[PDB]
Design a protein around this ligand. Structure first.
Ligand code: YS3
Lengths: 10, 238
């Protein structure tokens, strides 16, 4: 889904 | 009177903004270079992508934002990202010539630049009016960081699940802002200031909607969306 956003969100 | 809780909130949002907004703009050297018919797309795409990362690092630090599920966090940041970028960009905006001045001629962006990124007056004219009207409010930095936070944590974003929790967090922030204006913003600058700041959130919803229409139309041609970044594609779509 939003893996880059998810990752920046920790 | 500002509670201890409320002064805490402001302290944390100020520090959060300081740790995510470099007014020296030193990182701009890393972006694909500006070139002055879609010659500013690479550079402005890179600027935007960097700015999404900063706006996420701000969001994380909003007291209470972390208590939201990861899916609500994602909904809030996807819908608000372009709006917080437009907000936070008021800081480099200058009414001297209706442009965003990030430190040097290379990184000074005007109307022609934004049009060389694929946009039309339908966005650009209202975007400049917004920047102008926001500047004229002459916000304290405390007000500015509260408005960005209130922007991110809006319960009406389509896709929100725990709207009630989003609203409670946002209310805590709105209440802090309303009390801050009352206690620390001297009249006349403070006359209807809260209602004027909320108006700016409505202007941003309509800017977000037009930005989405033209982004979608820019990014339809795979040749243009080749020039974006992977983060931009993920957050704004396709
Ligand atoms: C660190 C920052 C902000 O985060 C970003 C700043 C500029 C923001 C601007 C002015 C130039 C045109 C921008 C990128 C707008 C432009 C319509 C985005 C273009 C795309 C993403 C290709 O649609 C959005 C915000 C605008 C400089 C500086 O204040």
């Amino acid at each position: 889904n939003h893996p880059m956003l998810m990752n920046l969100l920790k | 009177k500002l509670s201890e809780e409320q002064q805490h909130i402001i302290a944390i949002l100020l520090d959060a903004h300081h740790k995510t907004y470099d007014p020296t703009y030193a990182d701009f050297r890393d972006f694909r270079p500006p070139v002055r018919p879609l010659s500013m797309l690479p550079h402005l795409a890179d600027l935007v992508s960097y700015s999404i990362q900063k706006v996420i690092g701000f969001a994380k630090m909003i007291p209470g934002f972390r208590d939201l599920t990861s899916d609500d966090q994602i909904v809030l940041l996807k819908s608000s990202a372009i709006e917080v970028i437009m907000l936070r960009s008021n800081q480099s905006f200058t009414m001297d010539d209706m442009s965003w001045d990030c430190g040097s001629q290379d990184y000074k962006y005007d109307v022609t630049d934004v049009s060389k990124a694929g946009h039309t007056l339908e966005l650009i004219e209202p975007l400049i009016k917004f920047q102008v009207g926001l500047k004229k409010l002459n916000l304290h930095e405390e007000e500015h960081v509260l408005l960005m936070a209130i922007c991110i944590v809006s319960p009406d974003r389509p896709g929100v699940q725990d709207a009630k929790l989003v609203e409670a967090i946002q209310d805590r922030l709105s209440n802090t802002l309303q009390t801050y204006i009352r206690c620390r913003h001297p009249p006349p600058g403070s006359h209807q200031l809260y209602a004027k700041m909320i108006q700016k959130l409505a202007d941003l919803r309509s800017l977000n909607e037009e930005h989405s229409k033209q982004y979608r139309s820019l990014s339809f041609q795979p040749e243009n969306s080749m020039k974006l970044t992977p983060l931009v594609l993920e957050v704004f779509g396709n």
